[PDB]
Each structure stands twice: as structure tokens, then as C-alpha cells.
């Protein structure tokens, strides 16, 4: 007998492979598995793990977010790397001439980058140009702006959004939400 201080036969809890069956996505995983093993470059390990993420863990990154990151000191000529989808943003009226590597580009995003003089490349093209992630900049989208997050942690004095179907005067604004009706939260 052994006095165990922790649970036995416990899985790591991290994804070691993508859950999807996309054949082309598996090829990229195979490419960066080889690179992460034989380069000791921190960039390759980050990209490989990002390929395993689910859809909600890879929020879209707009071109306006890309332009803002290029305005950082000394980042004007760096290659923007997004493991996910790059979307278009019409709220911005000026775009730089950078190089962007991403899994997917929307029609508007690709046209806007090319019209400004830049180029859109895939992740395998990035590996040929920068096998060790030279002069790269990794951008991630916002996870907590998702609609589902605002309902998490509901309770008294928490200031979270209730799970409701119809919003209006007669829908959960009575007793429990104002002092004139019993009490307020």
C-alpha cells in the first residue's frame, strides 16, 4: 500500500492535438511539431499549442488591431502572426504596408491588406521565411468580449447579466431589483 498525496493516473488537462479532422490543419501541426522539437525556439512552441485551440479560444483579430500594434515603438517592420482568422474593420481609414501571416483571411481583410501594399501569407510560408520566428509579433483577440462570459458568476451583488429571453419593462425588474419592491439585490 502507498499513501497517495495526489490523484493517480491524472491526465495533463491540456490538448495535445487538434480536435478537428481538417486534413490541411493536421499538416501544419506536423510541420510545427518537427520545428518545435529541433529548434529550441520559444516561438515555435507557442504556435504549435495555438493550433490546438478551439474556436472560442481563437477570437478573430481585426485589421484595426493589427494597425494599432504596428504603431508600437520599433514594431513597424515586424511580421504580424495570427493563429486564427483576420477580419476587416471599416472604422479605420489608414493601413500600413506590413506582412501578415494567418490561418484565414476574410474577403475584406485580404483586399484591404493587399490594397495598402502588404501581403497575406499562410503559416507554412512563414515557417520558410522565419524558421525560428525572427522579427515576428503574435497577436491574440479578446476572449472576455464573448456574449456567454457576461452570464458567468451570476449571483447577488455580482453585477452579471441574467440569462433571459425577452428584455423589457415586465421582465425581471420587479422585487429584488429596486428598493420600492422589497429589496435591491
Amino acid at each position: 500500500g502507498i499513501d497517495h498525496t495526489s490523484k493517480q493516473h491524472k491526465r495533463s488537462g491540456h490538448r495535445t492535438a487538434p480536435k478537428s479532422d481538417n486534413v490541411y490543419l493536421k499538416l501544419l501541426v506536423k510541420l510545427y511539431t518537427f520545428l518545435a522539437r529541433r529548434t529550441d525556439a520559444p516561438f515555435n512552441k507557442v504556435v504549435l499549442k495555438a493550433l490546438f485551440l478551439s474556436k472560442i479560444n481563437r477570437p478573430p483579430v481585426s485589421v484595426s488591431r493589427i494597425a494599432r500594434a504596428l504603431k508600437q515603438e520599433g514594431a513597424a517592420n515586424k511580421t504580424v502572426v495570427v493563429v486564427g482568422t483576420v477580419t476587416d474593420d471599416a472604422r479605420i481609414f489608414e493601413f500600413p504596408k506590413t506582412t501578415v501571416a494567418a490561418l484565414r483571411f476574410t474577403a475584406g481583410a485580404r483586399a484591404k491588406i493587399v490594397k495598402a501594399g502588404g501581403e497575406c501569407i499562410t503559416l507554412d510560408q512563414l515557417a520558410v521565411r522565419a524558421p525560428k520566428g525572427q522579427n515576428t509579433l503574435i497577436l491574440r483577440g479578446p476572449r472576455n468580449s464573448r456574449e456567454a462570459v457576461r452570464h458567468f458568476g451570476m449571483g447577488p451583488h455580482k453585477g452579471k447579466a441574467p440569462r433571459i429571453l425577452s428584455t423589457g419593462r415586465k421582465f425581471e425588474r420587479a422585487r429584488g431589483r429596486r428598493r420600492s419592491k422589497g429589496f435591491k439585490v
Partner: protein, 99 residues
């Protein structure tokens, strides 16, 4: 029957709803019969265009008043200004609305 953090539901199924369930299995069948009806009507009616001429009217309400659509029929004054009578217009393929 209230548990966990879930939205309040309002499903109205406390009557004999299973006695009044209508599944549109014949959606494809009715489309064929409608096309057959239009084909038979056109061959039978006349070489006329199978539908009457409609006017252009302003949609009511502040939400839709920015668009024009097809109305019921031409007014008596509109028909008179075109140079023909309402009785003759109805027999020539022009919809006439008197109200």
C-alpha cells in the same frame, strides 16, 4: 421543477396540441400543382399576360413610407386622366380601385 441558472421558458403545450399538428409533407407537391395550374390557366385564358396591371402607391406608416410598392388598382381620376372609362379598363387588363 426549477433548478440551476437557466432562462425562464414559456412553452405553450398544456392543451391537446398533438391533435392539431400540421406537417407540410406536400410542399414539393403543392409547388408542382401550382405550376400546373398556372400553365393550364395561361393556355386556356387568352394570349393575355395572366395578370392585371397594378399602380404604384406609397406604403403607409412612418416605418415604411420611404418605399413605393404595387397597390390594388388605379383610381377613377387616374383612369379618366389616361383617356378611357373604368368599365372599359377592367375588360382590357387594368385593375381599377374605387376607394
Amino acid at each position: 421543477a426549477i433548478s440551476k441558472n437557466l432562462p425562464i421558458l414559456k412553452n405553450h403545450f398544456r392543451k391537446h396540441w398533438q391533435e392539431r399538428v400540421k406537417v407540410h409533407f406536400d410542399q414539393a407537391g403543392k409547388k408542382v400543382s401550382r405550376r400546373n395550374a398556372r400553365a393550364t390557366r395561361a393556355a386556356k385564358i387568352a394570349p393575355r399576360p395572366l395578370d392585371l396591371l397594378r399602380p404604384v402607391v406609397r406604403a403607409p406608416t412612418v416605418k415604411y413610407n420611404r418605399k413605393v410598392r404595387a397597390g390594388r388598382g388605379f383610381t377613377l381620376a387616374e383612369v379618366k386622366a389616361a383617356g378611357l372609362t373604368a368599365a372599359y379598363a377592367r375588360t382590357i387588363g387594368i385593375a381599377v380601385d374605387h376607394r
